Amino acid sequence: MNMLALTIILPLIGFVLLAFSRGRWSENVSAIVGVGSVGLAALVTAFIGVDFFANGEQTYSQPLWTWMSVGDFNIGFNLVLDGLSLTMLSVVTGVGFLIHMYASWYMRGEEGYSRFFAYTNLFIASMVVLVLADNLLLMYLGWEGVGLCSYLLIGFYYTDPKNGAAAMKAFVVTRVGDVFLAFALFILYNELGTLNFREMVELAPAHFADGNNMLMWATLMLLGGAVGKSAQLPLQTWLADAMAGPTPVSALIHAATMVTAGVYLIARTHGLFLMTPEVLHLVGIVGAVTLLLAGFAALVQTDIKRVLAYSTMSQIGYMFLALGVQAWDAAIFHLMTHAFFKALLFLASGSVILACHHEQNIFKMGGLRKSIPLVYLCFLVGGAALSALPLVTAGFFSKDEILAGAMANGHINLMVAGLVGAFMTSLYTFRMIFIVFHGKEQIVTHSLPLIVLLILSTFVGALIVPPLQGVLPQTTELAHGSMLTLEITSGVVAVVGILLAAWLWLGKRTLVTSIANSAPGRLLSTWWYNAWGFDWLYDKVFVKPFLGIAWLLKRDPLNSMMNIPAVLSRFAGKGLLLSENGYLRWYVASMSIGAVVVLALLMVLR
Amino acid sequence: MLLPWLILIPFIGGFLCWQTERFGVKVPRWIALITMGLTLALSLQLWLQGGYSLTQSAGIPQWQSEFDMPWIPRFGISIHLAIDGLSLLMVVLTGLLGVLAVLCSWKEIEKYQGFFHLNLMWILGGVIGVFLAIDMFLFFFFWEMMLVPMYFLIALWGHKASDGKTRITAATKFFIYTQASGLVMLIAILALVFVHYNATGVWTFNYEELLNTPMSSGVEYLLMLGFFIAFAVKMPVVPLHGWLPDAHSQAPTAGSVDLAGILLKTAAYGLLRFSLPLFPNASAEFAPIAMWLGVIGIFYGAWMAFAQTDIKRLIAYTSVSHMGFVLIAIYTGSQLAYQGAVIQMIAHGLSAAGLFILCGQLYERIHTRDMRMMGGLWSKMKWLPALSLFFAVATLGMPGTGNFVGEFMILFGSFQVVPVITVISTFGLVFASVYSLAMLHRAYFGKAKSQIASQELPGMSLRELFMILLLVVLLVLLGFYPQPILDTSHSAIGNIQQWFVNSV
Numbered sequence A: 001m002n003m004l005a006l007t008i009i010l011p012l013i014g015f016v017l018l019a020f021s022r023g024r025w026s027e028n029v030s031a032i033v034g035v036g037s038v039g040l041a042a043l044v045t046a047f048i049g050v051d052f053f054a055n056g057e058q059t060y061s062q063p064l065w066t067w068m069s070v071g072d073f074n075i076g077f078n079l080v081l082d083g084l085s086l087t088m089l090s091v092v093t094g095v096g097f098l099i100h101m102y103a104s105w106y107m108r109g110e111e112g113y114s115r116f117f118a119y120t121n122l123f124i125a126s127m128v129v130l131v132l133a134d135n136l137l138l139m140y141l142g143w144e145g146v147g148l149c150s151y152l153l154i155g156f157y158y159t160d161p162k163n164g165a166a167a168m169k170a171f172v173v174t175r176v177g178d179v180f181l182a183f184a185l186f187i188l189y190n191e192l193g194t195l196n197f198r199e200m201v202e203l204a205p206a207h208f209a210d211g212n213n214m215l216m217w218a219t220l221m222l223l224g225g226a227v228g229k230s231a232q233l234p235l236q237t238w239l240a241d242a243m244a245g246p247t248p249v250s251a252l253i254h255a256a257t258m259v260t261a262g263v264y265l266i267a268r269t270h271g272l273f274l275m276t277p278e279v280l281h282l283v284g285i286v287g288a289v290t291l292l293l294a295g296f297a298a299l300v301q302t303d304i305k306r307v308l309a310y311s312t313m314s315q316i317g318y319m320f321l322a323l324g325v326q327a328w329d330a331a332i333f334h335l336m337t338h339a340f341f342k343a344l345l346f347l348a349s350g351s352v353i354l355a356c357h358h359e360q361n362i363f364k365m366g367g368l369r370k371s372i373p374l375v376y377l378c379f380l381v382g383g384a385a386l387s388a389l390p391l392v393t394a395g396f397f398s399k400d401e402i403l404a405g406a407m408a409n410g411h412i413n414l415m416v417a418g419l420v421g422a423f424m425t426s427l428y429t430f431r432m433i434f435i436v437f438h439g440k441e442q443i444v445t446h447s448l449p450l451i452v453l454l455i456l457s458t459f460v461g462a463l464i465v466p467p468l469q470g471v472l473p474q475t476t477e478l479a480h481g482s483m484l485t486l487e488i489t490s491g492v493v494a495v496v497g498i499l500l501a502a503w504l505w506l507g508k509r510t511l512v513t514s515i516a517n518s519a520p521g522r523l524l525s526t527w528w529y530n531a532w533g534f535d536w537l538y539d540k541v542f543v544k545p546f547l548g549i550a551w552l553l554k555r556d557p558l559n560s561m562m563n564i565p566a567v568l569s570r571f572a573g574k575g576l577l578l579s580e581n582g583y584l585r586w587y588v589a590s591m592s593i594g595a596v597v598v599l600a601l602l603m604v605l606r
Numbered sequence B: 001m002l003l004p005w006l007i008l009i010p011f012i013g014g015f016l017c018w019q020t021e022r023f024g025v026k027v028p029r030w031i032a033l034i035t036m037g038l039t040l041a042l043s044l045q046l047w048l049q050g051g052y053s054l055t056q057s058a059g060i061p062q063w064q065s066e067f068d069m070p071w072i073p074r075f076g077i078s079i080h081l082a083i084d085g086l087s088l089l090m091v092v093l094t095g096l097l098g099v100l101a102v103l104c105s106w107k108e109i110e111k112y113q114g115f116f117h118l119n120l121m122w123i124l125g126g127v128i129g130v131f132l133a134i135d136m137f138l139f140f141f142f143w144e145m146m147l148v149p150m151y152f153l154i155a156l157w158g159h160k161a162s163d164g165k166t167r168i169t170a171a172t173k174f175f176i177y178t179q180a181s182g183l184v185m186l187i188a189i190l191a192l193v194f195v196h197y198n199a200t201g202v203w204t205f206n207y208e209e210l211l212n213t214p215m216s217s218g219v220e221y222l223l224m225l226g227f228f229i230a231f232a233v234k235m236p237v238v239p240l241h242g243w244l245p246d247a248h249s250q251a252p253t254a255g256s257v258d259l260a261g262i263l264l265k266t267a268a269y270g271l272l273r274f275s276l277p278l279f280p281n282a283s284a285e286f287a288p289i290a291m292w293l294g295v296i297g298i299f300y301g302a303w304m305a306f307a308q309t310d311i312k313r314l315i316a317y318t319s320v321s322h323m324g325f326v327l328i329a330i331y332t333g334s335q336l337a338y339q340g341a342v343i344q345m346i347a348h349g350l351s352a353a354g355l356f357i358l359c360g361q362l363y364e365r366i367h368t369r370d371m372r373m374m375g376g377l378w379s380k381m382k383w384l385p386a387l388s389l390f391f392a393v394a395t396l397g398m399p400g401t402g403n404f405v406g407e408f409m410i411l412f413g414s415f416q417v418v419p420v421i422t423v424i425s426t427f428g429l430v431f432a433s434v435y436s437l438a439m440l441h442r443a444y445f446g447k448a449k450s451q452i453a454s455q456e457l458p459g460m461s462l463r464e465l466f467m468i469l470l471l472v473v474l475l476v477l478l479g480f481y482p483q484p485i486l487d488t489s490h491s492a493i494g495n496i497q498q499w500f501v502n503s504v
Ligand SMILES: CCCCCCCCCCCCCCCCCC(=O)OC[C@H](COP(=O)(O)OCCN)OC(=O)CCCCCCCCCCCCCCCCC
Pocket: A008, A009, A012, A013, A016, A064, A065, A066, A129, B400, B476, B477, B480, B481, B483
């Protein structure tokens, strides 16, 4: 339990060694160092969890040093470990270890092997800092390190400028989110005088007994930072474009590390959102709208990685809906299940891409079940877990807990949104599955993570529970009949979505090509393909005036404004030099003019 | 006691580099290295023997060391030096950057290297004298003395690729700006001295005696306006800023001269030391104007740096934006914001030193500085693009480097004082990330759009890599453990803040 700092020391050592290797080591040694650092972090996490469960679920604290000490401003370098932190750390370390083994198989024969492994190790270390920090400033350190590693891993193939533009957009949107998080940090320190989470939940109701406006603003900017990092409304436009990295990069970003940070923000500071119910309802509304828009965008998407990204978007929207209905344990359980099956789906998608030896749209391939049976099985069970297939998959249990918490708290519009989102989720998931794996054919270091995520995306993942008792508040329990009919309705919605997908895309696409060519079909598909015009709006509202102001100011107008007196001095000197014409008669005339001027001035002023 | 030696050792060292050129051309670099090592060792010895961590605030004046010698007794002028935590921090930073500058021009075997080294050491001695003097005439003397070597270095030893007329034009613009601002500061100094003379009857230029000067409202405004014109030209503060990119563009190729005089925050130190304690009420009334000038400077530097096709001008406008951050910090009146300003100044000096050294090494490799002529340089250079990526990460306010601690403590104190300027400056931090990414992706990432960037380039030397990694280590240690730097300057910041907020 005292080795809580080893979970960051080992990935930091791996990142430093792999950065200073500069590719001089062999690929075997670099892969061994990277995946061994992540595996050592996972083993230390396992020992920490064993000691945590053997100690009766007591919260552990390990201070290391004091970060800043300026008067009352005391920020410390302390790590904390409760059930939520243990769940986050175990998810990050295990899924990162599986992704690192897959990448050690996957990045073979590629340049920047050590660079990739160093960036992923720094990503793991920064996410561990994020999930282990006891104060908001240390968690901001992990937050911004996670954003930096996301930037460095998205634009991994730096030769293509489109990857660089994607990394630019990702880092700028996440930096706007981090600025909102900084806004919340400033407000919380100005109000309560501290940045420790327990100190917030201790002396927040005493300070905010009279006024609640500043706490409302703090929770609003916390929500803004959360949706900045979780790729939700209104800061979601970066994800689909920032697909540009390799497959393990997308798996790590979408499943394990990057987009769960906003959920960890909302769940960690749950008391402050509990005393501001309107902000929590706004979190739920934002999640519902995000999952609905993600489903409608994923329905018409033609790229497998892009529809997987919008599936991740809808899953994080479900998670934010669970947070907005005070279903915290359901949200963290959904984090576990969604991380498992989204990692499985992304690894299977990378296997599909490597089998097709090119990144193509889903309509190009078809009937790939005969070529790759194991990858087809992985994609099938990942789609079943994502579509909440009942009784076989853990995604059904996690989503059932989410809507049980939603309906048990009196939220009915969110219930309807969740049911429609589940129907659309099954629809787009098995639409993509049936397009990419059914039709007419045209064209040990990785099997183990695929098998582990194969097991964990089934009910074996639902057998694992997170130790969130005593950390997050308990959900209000639903009636047995209401829970039974909710499970029945969710399962019925799932199977009718499966049957509609089999009607619409497993056979010859007649009704799809019937509803496609119409002008409502063109406008709806154009709107949903371009993420409902959000990226276009942010290009026309934030990018284009920025470029216009840069082009208008590239000549430094203030420099010319302050250089104007130099031009005036030069012109005045040139004008005054005309009196030095060298004529003696003019000199005598000027002397007499000066005599007249001096005498007139003396007569006037006398 | 050691302060006169702390100032005279660079001057005697520069005279030695000029004189010992007869024994060899490779000699004056070693002499300059020895005397900057001695200056840095004296600064570190003052740090160790000062006991700055255990020192508590007692009010202005409170100096850890003090030296007095009469210079012009007719006007009551003394060579009067004094060191405390803030001045010692700036002296240590000056010594470190001087050692880095001496090492950065180690491969110059020019026929007149001795006068170049004298010129550099006289710049460093003038900067140290600015940081040490607590006499108004002596402070102004060093302030305008450190500009003639600056001018001659830019004009004669400047960028050899550019024409001589552009170098002379940029150097003359820089000298005219800095010396006219210094003259206005001298007029403010003289009017303050004469006001104290009419109020008291004693001729003096001492900072301690001029603190308790009874002035009417309006005269104090004019005096602080002159001080602010000087400290805003050399900060730079918009619109009084074009000399900085013009001089950075025409700076010497190695980039040492950038680190020697242009990169050290004498103006913000003067704002903390002279503008706020001498004129507290007038600075309190001028705080909104200075804070909005800092906001406008942050965004003007950001929009300037994004639109720059030159790397050196990009780093210059980065300096403009970060100095706008410091200017916002100084006029808050908060201890936390002042400590953040000190940390930000030190970290920004380190980061800009690393950026300028890497840009100079890149220009040695490729002989160009236009962003339309580089791209995809990551695959051709062994060490340079990753280190430049680290330093550009440092200048965007990334946690793990001291710049983040700087701007975040600045914004914490500012939000404790003024929230709207804080939120707009955080959007300025977003703009900082924007231009850092733009520079990184235009310089080292993509496909090469020139022939000179299509060939393999030689790796960096051992000394350049060693000093850049030393800067990396110092920036990382400042980001993770800024506590010794905070306890070093806790007493001086406390004295200045208490004098500012107890006299309004
Ligand atoms: C954020 C990631 C997780 C954190 C670890 C890595 C952080 C960055 C590593 C580089 C910078 C380290 C700066 C601190 C080094 C230790 C010195 C220190 O802080 O001593 C203070 C404390 C003893 O003094 P105390 O009084 O208790 O402190 C409170 C304030 N008075 O000291 C103690 O109580 C002992 C503390 C021991 C800590 C050992 C950490 C080793 C880390 C090795 C990292 C290797 C890679 C470095 C580069 C990584 C990439 C940037």
